[PDB]
Design a protein around this ligand. Structure first.
Ligand SMILES: *[C@@H]1O[C@H](CO)[C@@H](O)[C@H](O)[C@H]1NC(C)=O
Lengths: 49, 49
């Protein structure tokens, strides 16, 4: 949270905003692994008592 | 989201567009405790100079 420091980032371009997409890029697919390894069935079965 | 996506037709999905933080207002500072006074009265108001 430094105003003058942030100005130095603008002239350096679009690096960190790009990897923020990349980090979210891995994050969104990180959960995508879960349903394709656990949510293989759309019917929830309860065992008999 | 439109500005960061560089488009006017955004699809249904999650989009992280910015960040937020709480800005301090008063910025209080209470470090000191007045002690170890060196007498300036012994050099300003001494009887004999
Ligand atoms: C000395 O006495 C005068 C008059 O009371 C006062 O104005 C001055 O601040 C005193 N000096 C010190 C540092 O004691």
């Amino acid at each position: 949270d430094s105003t003058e420091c942030s100005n130095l980032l603008l002239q350096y371009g679009s690096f960190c905003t790009q990897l923020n997409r990349a980090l979210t890029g891995i994050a969104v697919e990180q959960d995508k692994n879960t349903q394709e390894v656990f949510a293989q069935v759309k019917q929830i079965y309860k065992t008999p008592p | 989201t439109k500005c960061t996506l560089k488009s006017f037709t955004v699809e249904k999905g999650i989009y992280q567009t910015s960040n937020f933080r709480v800005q301090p207002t008063e910025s209080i500072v209470r470090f000191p405790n007045i002690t170890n006074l060196c007498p300036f009265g012994e050099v300003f108001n001494a009887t004999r100079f």
